[PDB]
Curated annotation (Swiss-Prot):
<comment type="similarity">
    <text>Belongs to the ATP-dependent AMP-binding enzyme family.</text>
</comment>
<protein>
    <recommendedName>
        <fullName>Tyrocidine synthase 1</fullName>
    </recommendedName>
</protein>
<comment type="subunit">
    <text>Large multienzyme complex of TycA, TycB and TycC.</text>
</comment>
<comment type="function">
    <text>In the first step of peptide synthesis this enzyme activates phenylalanine and racemizes it to the D-isomer.</text>
</comment>
Length: 398
């Protein structure tokens, strides 16, 4: 690789390394409950053994219909450890959207919990259902499994809707690269306390989760109640001394910097209209303006707002992150000089395999990269231009 990362390693192997190195550090917190790395790894290994007995193997698509909880994290790690891919089903979605996704994914096994079991019955799922908080796993072996795995294996499938819902197929490789990117560029260490803002069916939530779990850091799962009340959100971050959070700009605009002291890095996805937000926070923490679709593992470019500088008027999306490439091209995929507007196309290790059972759309969006023969590049449909200082400005849709 151009920039070193843990090549040849799967997501669960990177987690197992952290669990070995920091067994007693806190791994996940949800309300009054918490698990250390060792307790989390042990529980995930027991469930992984049960999943293996049910047929979970390479590229098996395991549906997950669970609350934003510690059990959902155990389920994710267990699916990965068994060698399968997890497909989170957003339990807030209307019944018909869940039914469409279940049918499209063709999943033969759904992992759920007691409080979500009636929803699984109501969506009429006829495959195998494992109710995790009804499964007797406490007697199973707790050691790591060591199932065969390659970084090109499917790790997860994220569904999103814009026509019909489509599943983006993400492999282990991009998340392994993001582990090194977060450690290098965000300074992530085991001392960090990371808030999980997004619900676990969103690709950005999977990314936030592994930003903590692949570095020995703690992940604080923020409840719906904490998020719904701005004062409660500020108090939760302050009480628990959270150091990293990724938020949407529309949520960040309601927060008071004085009420949050502990944050060392804040990541958000905005453009020029977020200049007042950047100017307000850039001097209080490391402000990161990030850009990256699900199709490239939720990361593509970053711009850290220079702190010791006068107010900015424009907010770029920055430069490509390690082992990724950005191209600004015209309709014929020809490169454009500075100042010329074109389509943002992304290459490199974060690229999705494609869209689940959508071969024509996959071929249309993940095209041959003419600049790096033998590789693909993703056509974002986003308009952008290079600035002469070498940063990219986001301009909307093509
Ligand atoms: Cl191993």
């Amino acid at each position: 690789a151009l920039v070193p990362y843990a090549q040849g390693k799967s997501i669960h192997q990177l987690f197992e390394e952290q669990a070995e190195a920091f067994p007693d550090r806190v791994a996940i917190v949800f309300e009054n409950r918490r698990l250390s790395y060792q307790e989390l790894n042990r529980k995930a290994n027991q469930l992984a053994r049960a999943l293996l007995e049910k047929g979970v193997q390479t590229d098996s698509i395991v549906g997950v219909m669970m609350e934003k909880s510690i059990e959902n994290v155990i389920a994710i790690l267990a699916v990965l450890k068994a060698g399968g891919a997890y497909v989170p089903i957003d339990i807030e979605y209307p019944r018909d959207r869940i039914q469409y996704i279940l049918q499209d994914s063709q999943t033969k096994i759904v992992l759920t919990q007691k409080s979500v079991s009636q929803l699984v019955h109501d969506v009429g799922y006829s495959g195998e259902v494992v109710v995790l908080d009804e499964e007797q796993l406490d007697a199973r072996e707790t050691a790591n499994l060591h199932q065969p795995s390659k970084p090109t294996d499917l790790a997860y499938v994220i569904y999103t809707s814009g026509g019909k819902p489509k599943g983006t197929m993400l492999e282990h490789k991009g998340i392994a690269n993001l582990q090194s990117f977060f450690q290098n560029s965000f300074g992530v260490t085991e001392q960090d306390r990371i808030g999980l803002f997004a619900s676990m069916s969103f690709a950005a939530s999977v990314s936030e989760m592994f930003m903590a779990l692949l570095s020995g850091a703690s992940l604080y799962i923020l409840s719906k109640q904490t998020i719904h009340d701005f004062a409660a959100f500020e108090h939760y971050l302050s009480e628990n001394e959270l150091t990293i959070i990724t938020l949407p700009p529309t949520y960040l605009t309601h927060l008071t910097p004085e009420r949050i002291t502990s944050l060392r890095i804040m990541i958000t996805a905005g453009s020029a209209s977020s200049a007042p937000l950047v100017n307000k926070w850039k001097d209080k923490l490391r402000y990161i303006n990030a850009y990256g679709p699900t199709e490239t593992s939720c990361s593509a470019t970053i711009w850290e707002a220079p702190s010791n500088q006068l107010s900015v008027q424009s907010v770029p999306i920055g430069k490509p992150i390690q082992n990724t490439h950005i191209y600004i091209v015209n309709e014929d995929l020809q490169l454009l000089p500075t100042g010329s507007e074109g389509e943002l196309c992304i290459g490199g290790v974060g690229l999705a395999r494609g869209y689940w059972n959508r071969p024509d759309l996959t071929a249309e969006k993940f095209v041959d990269n003419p600049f790096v023969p033998g590789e693909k590049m993703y056509r974002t449909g986003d308009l952008a231009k290079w600035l002469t200082d070498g940063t990219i400005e986001f301009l909307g849709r093509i």
